[PDB]
Amino acid sequence: SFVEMVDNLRGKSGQGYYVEMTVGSPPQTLNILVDTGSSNFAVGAAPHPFLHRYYQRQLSSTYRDLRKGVYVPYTQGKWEGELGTDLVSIPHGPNVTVRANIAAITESDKFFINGSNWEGILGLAYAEIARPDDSLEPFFDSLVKQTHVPNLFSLQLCGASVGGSMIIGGIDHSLYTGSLWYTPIRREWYYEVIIVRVEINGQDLKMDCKEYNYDKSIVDSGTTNLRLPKKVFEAAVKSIKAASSTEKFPDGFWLGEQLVCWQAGTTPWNIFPVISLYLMGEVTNQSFRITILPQQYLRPVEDVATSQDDCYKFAISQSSTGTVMGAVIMEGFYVVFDRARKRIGFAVSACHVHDEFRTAAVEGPFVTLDMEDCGYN
Numbered sequence: 001s002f003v004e005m006v007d008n009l010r011g012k013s014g015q016g017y018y019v020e021m022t023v024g025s026p027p028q029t030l031n032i033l034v035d036t037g038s039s040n041f042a043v044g045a046a047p048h049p050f051l052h053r054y055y056q057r058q059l060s061s062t063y064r065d066l067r068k069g070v071y072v073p074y075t076q077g078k079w080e081g082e083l084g085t086d087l088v089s090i091p092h093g094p095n096v097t098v099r100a101n102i103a104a105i106t107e108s109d110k111f112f113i114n115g116s117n118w119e120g121i122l123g124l125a126y127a128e129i130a131r132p133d134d135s136l137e138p139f140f141d142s143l144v145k146q147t148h149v150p151n152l153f154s155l156q157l158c159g160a161s162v163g164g165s166m167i168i169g170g171i172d173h174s175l176y177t178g179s180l181w182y183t184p185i186r187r188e189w190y191y192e193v194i195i196v197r198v199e200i201n202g203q204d205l206k207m208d209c210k211e212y213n214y215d216k217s218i219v220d221s222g223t224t225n226l227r228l229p230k231k232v233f234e235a236a237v238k239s240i241k242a243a244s245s246t247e248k249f250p251d252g253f254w255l256g257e258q259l260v261c262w263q264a265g266t267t268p269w270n271i272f273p274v275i276s277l278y279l280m281g282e283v284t285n286q287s288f289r290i291t292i293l294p295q296q297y298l299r300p301v302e303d304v305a306t307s308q309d310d311c312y313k314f315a316i317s318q319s320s321t322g323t324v325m326g327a328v329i330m331e332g333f334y335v336v337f338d339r340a341r342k343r344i345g346f347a348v349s350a351c352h353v354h355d356e357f358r359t360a361a362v363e364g365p366f367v368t369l370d371m372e373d374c375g376y377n
């Protein structure tokens with residue numbers, strides 16, 4: 001019955017994927033950003049320059065005030081508001097209605113995006129990282145308790161403006177090719193995984209694999225970039241610089257500040273390497289790898305000049321909070337969040353990025369010794 005949910009995500013490139021939801025009685029309709037890197041369901045509830053509509057508690061005959069304040073700070077950008085509950089639906093989702101916690105955003109800073117077309121956020125992670133504390137049941141925990149929807153969901157994000165699918169409660173086998181490869185969820189707070197090996201153009205980075213997961217590695221649909229721990233980032237940028245030394249780039253390009261442009265249709269794709277992330281498998285000593293093409297970590301942007309040059313931002317950035325496999329990483333793939341079986345599945349998506357001679361891939365099995373030593377404590 002999942003075809004009703006196929007293609008239910010829209011977005012403007014780099015500004016997040018959203019699904020359509022209704023809250024309150026009568027139903028008020030909002031576009032909600034789908035975020036696996038947080039756990040709070042929150043909507044705008046007061047006018048804002050970048051909001052074209054918002055939740056009106058006054059008009060919902062099912063609203064209930066919880067008389068507690070709340071705030072969530074993200075990587076950068078933050079909001080505060082007032083907790084409450086109300087009935088919630090997903091028109092292009094399962095045909096159910098749940099009473100769910102909602103934070104009515106009343107003040108915010110650098111959170112809403114000009115022209116993103118979404119007005120709220122759906123944190124799909126676990127209660128442990130909910131604010132103010134872990135006793136505020138996140139939306140998906142409420143959905144699974146109060147209905148018969150099974151405890152998993154899958155995301156198919158398609159690159160560029162953009163679209164995709166959120167299959168709530170199951171797997172749609174027509175959204176991927178090949179087999180699904182699963183990696184354990186190490187701890188139920190973020191969607192935390194263990195990268196066990198990293199290769200660039202088939203060349204192992206040869207780092208202590210604890211470096212890959214220092215201090216964590218997570219799957220985060222709410223962040224554009226692939227974010228790497230400092231030492232892994234420096235190692236990776238060195239190998240990408242070397243592979244593409246045929247041409248010259250500003251050093252501010254490697255920091256994500258300056259674009260790079262080529263005459264339309266002449267992007268030298270062949271000089272940027274593929275990146276392989278090996279993920280811990282489901283059986284002893286076993287792993288699988290996902291291959292990222294340059295078309296995923298060179299994200300397209302708007303031409304600053306009056307040209308039709310193709311221009312790109314570098315979407316690999318340095319991190320101090322661990323590895324983030326962001327929307328950039330997820331676009332090649334169908335990603336199953338099998339909460340019921342504590343695992344995350346990857347497969348090549350039906351809408352996979354296309355290179356002339358290379359292809360994104362999910363390949364296995366691989367044998368990897370001592371995968372347990374790769375998690376950071």
Ligand SMILES: CC(=O)c1cc2cc(c1)C(=O)N[C@H]([C@H](O)CNC1(c3cccc(C(C)C)c3)CC1)Cc1cccc(c1)OCCCCN2
Nearest residue numbers: 014015016035037038072073074075076111129222223224
């Ligand atoms: C580089 C940068 O600055 C940056 C860039 C991007 C997102 C975020 C930060 C961002 O902050 N994205 C948040 C996610 O939740 C982030 N998740 C993490 C996080 C960080 C701090 C605190 C928490 C708690 C609250 C669980 C969680 C775990 C990483 C969710 C989010 C908030 C506001 C707008 C968003 C998206 O759309 C923008 C489109 C995507 C743009 N790309």
